[PDB]
Amino acid sequence: QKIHVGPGELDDYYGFWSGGHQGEVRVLGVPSMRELMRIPVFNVDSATGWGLTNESRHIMGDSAKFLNGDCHHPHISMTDGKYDGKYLFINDKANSRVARIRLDIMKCDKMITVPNVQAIHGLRLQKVPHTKYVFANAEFIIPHPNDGKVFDLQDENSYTMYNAIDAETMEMAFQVIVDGNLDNTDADYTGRFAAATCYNSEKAFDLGGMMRNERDWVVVFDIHAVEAAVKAGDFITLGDSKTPVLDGRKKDGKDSKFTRYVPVPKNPHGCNTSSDGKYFIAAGKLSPTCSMIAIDKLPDLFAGKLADPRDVIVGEPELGLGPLHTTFDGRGNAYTTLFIDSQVVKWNMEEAVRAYKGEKVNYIKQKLDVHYQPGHLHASLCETNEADGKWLVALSKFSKDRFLPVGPLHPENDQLIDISGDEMKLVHDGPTFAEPHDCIMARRDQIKTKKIWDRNDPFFAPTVEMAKKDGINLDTDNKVIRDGNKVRVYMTSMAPAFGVQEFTVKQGDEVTVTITNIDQIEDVSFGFVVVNHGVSMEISPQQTSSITFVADKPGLHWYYCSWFCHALHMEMVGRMMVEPAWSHPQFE
């Protein structure tokens, strides 16, 4: 297996890395581990103007006021248990959002703030028959309503909820109230079941309280039952949200129709569906184990055919200190991070199942030292029934001495490991910023990108509609539209000239500049920066982009093209002339 990608060679896989607390998504080539692109999502990107432009702020909605995000869990949409390459979805734990990235243009095209919850952490996708739902955990228990009268986590109206988003519309589909809380989540290969770990069955707020119980659980959702209750109208709504809310809590020991709680030790974390569809595998964290839930025993669990919820556990291998996450090679082996022992443990799922029945067998095949304190790990295609067992990335939280010193803040160490053979081979240490938690790989042929925008792309269709109200044809026009104290500049552009190279406004006018890159040559992107006004955006081939700012300073103000586009790039500039307020009518 080739490890190094030389000049002129291409990588074999795309990697989509979470940006962690930095808030973006990063596209890597694998196995080179080089970063090919950054996709802004919850961060504000100076380069493309994401968070500044009108198109991006429209997608972000009211949450455009936040300049931060905290993303952990990138996942690719699937059809019949295989990636279909349409969308990447990712969480925001900081401001409680889910974002969608369109993989043909490699941009965030939709974003939603999940209502009546705090902190979207775990996130994964329905696999079968396709990604109808995005499943997202809200991690923190809060009051309902959260109006400041009640703060007690033990109140009967304090809880968190499991969240289903319609992947295509990016509107809420339903929410399920649960006991305890929600950490990570995964889905089966039938569409009936999803599952989530809980570490706060105690509903505590202090460290000791959250570790009190010997077992928490993974909660299992019967999605068929949830859908059935929604269609029957058997649900409530919270606050001003129209999202159907179903009650998945136990009441006086009787189970809900929507949920079953499988006791699992202890403050469990990772929740990973095996690629053969057989198991939800929960990482025991404070317990030195993983718990294997047999997915084919869940219908019987939901039909009272089992005496004890633990009867759906068919394995609980002891693996090492601090199990956090598990991935799969498609050959019947699982790979689990041990945070405390600082290792990846490779183990055979069917032998662990046999040892659980007493048959003394050594299911542990290898322990590889990683550097250091691994969190998530990811094997290529692990989330599909095409898991190919080639590459493994372990994403470790302390890099210590593995890279040159760069001051008190250290990079993370995402290590590429060869798993095509019986023996795990550490091949590359990849330093990364801001703590990617997880990542996802896709074959090169699973991703199909556009090299030039379509003119009807929904990403800027609202801007096209605005332009139409002014009588503008964006493909041809270079016009300055005036409307009271608003000025709307529309221009085409082609290297190395802006189609409108000067315009004049009054001091205090609100200026919108809309630019259409009317060339069709791949890689010839333009920028637009207004000096000393905090204005910057990208305009790639056939894109329309727009940005709005106040001309608060009299005098002449240069704008220029920021993206090197031509040998005359330094010369692709223009001038905004601002007439002073004392020369125009005076308002208070």
Q: Which residues bind ligand CUA (CB under 6 A)?
A: 495-496, 526, 561, 563-566, 569, 572
> Stretches 105-113, 183-191, 518-526, 559-567: which one binds Cl ion (CB under 5 A)?
183-191
User: For a copy of itself, which residue of 119, 245, 392, 489 counts as binding (CB under 8 A)?
Assistant: 119
270 binds, among Na ion, Cl ion, a copy of itself, none (CB under 5 to 8 A by kind): Cl ion
Residue 216 interacting partner from Ca ion, a copy of itself, ligand CUZ, none (CB closer than 5 to 8 Å by kind) = Ca ion
Question: Is residue 445 part of the contact set for a copy of itself (CB under 8 A)?
Answer: no
CA separation, residue 69 to residues 21, 41, 63, 395, 407 (Å): 6, 8, 10, 19, 24
Q: Select from 449, 473, 482, 483 the one that contacts a copy of itself (CB under 8 A).
A: 449
Q: Is 221 left (phi over 0), alpha (psi -120 to 50) or beta?
A: beta
- Closest approach of Cβ 435 to a copy of itself, in Å? 6
Give me the least distance between CB of 96 and ligand CUA, in Å please: 19
Residue found under tokens 């929604």 = 230
Binding to a copy of itself (CB under 8 A): which residues in 59-88? 65-70
Residue closer to K ion (CB basis): 21 or 390:
21
Residues 6+ apart with CB under 8 A from 18: 25, 26, 71, 72, 73, 74, 90, 436, 437, 438, 439
Pick the piece of the chain touching a copy of itself (CB under 8 A) from 167-175, 234-242, 291-299, 431-439: 431-439
Using CB under 8 A, pick the residue from 230, 238, 306, 340 that binds a copy of itself. 340
CA angle 425, 426, 427 (to 5 degrees): 105
CB nearer to ligand CUA: give 243 or 542: 542
Cα torsion 481, 487, 490, 491: sign: positive
**Minimum distance from residue 345 beta carbon to Cl ion (Å):** 16
List C-alpha distances in Å: 240 to 58, 236, 243.
Answer: 21, 12, 9
Query: Which parts of this chain interact with ligand CUZ (CB under 6 A)?
Result: 72-73, 121, 184, 269, 324-325, 375-376, 437-438
Q: Which is nearer to ligand CUA, 132 or 437 (CB)?
A: 437
CB of 441 within 8 A of CB of 396? no
Contact pattern for a copy of itself over residues 185 through 214, marking x by CB under 8 A: --------------x-----xxx--xx---
The sign of the dihedral angle between the CA atoms of 205, 290, 314, 303 is positive
How many Å apart are CA 127 and CA 231, to the nearest integer?
22
The tokens of 456 are what? 């009807």
For ligand CUZ, the closer of residues 320 and 375 by Cβ is 375
| Amino acid symbol at 516 | T
Secondary structure in 3-state letters for 463-483: HHHHHHHCCCCCCCCCEEEEE
Distance CA 325, CA 335 (A): 8
Contacting residue, 126, 184, 185, 267, with Ca ion by CB under 5 A = 267
Q: Does 277 bind a copy of itself (CB under 8 A)?
A: no
Minimum Å gap between C-beta 283 and Ca ion is: 14
Taking a C-beta distance cutoff of 8 angstroms, is the pair 415, 342 a contact?
no
Q: Does 270 bind Cl ion (CB under 5 A)?
A: yes
Q: How far is CA 366 from CA 326, 350, 362, 494, 585, in A?
A: 14, 16, 11, 58, 79
CB of 70 to Na ion, least distance (A): 19
Q: Which is nearer to a copy of itself, 12 or 388 (CB)?
A: 12
Given the rule CB under 5 A, which of 47-55, 181-189, 459-467, 487-495 is the region that contacts Cl ion? 181-189
Q: CA-CA distance, 3 to 445, in Å (whole number)?
A: 19
Estimate to the nearest angstrom the gap between the alpha carbon of 103 and the chain centroid: 13
Among the listed residues 53, 184, 446, 516, the single contact to Cl ion using CB under 5 A? 184
Chain residue at closest Cβ approach to K ion: 397
The residue ranges that bind Ca ion (CB under 5 A) are 199, 213, 216, 267
The residue ranges that bind Cl ion (CB under 5 A) are 184, 270-271
The residue ranges that bind Na ion (CB under 5 A) are 112
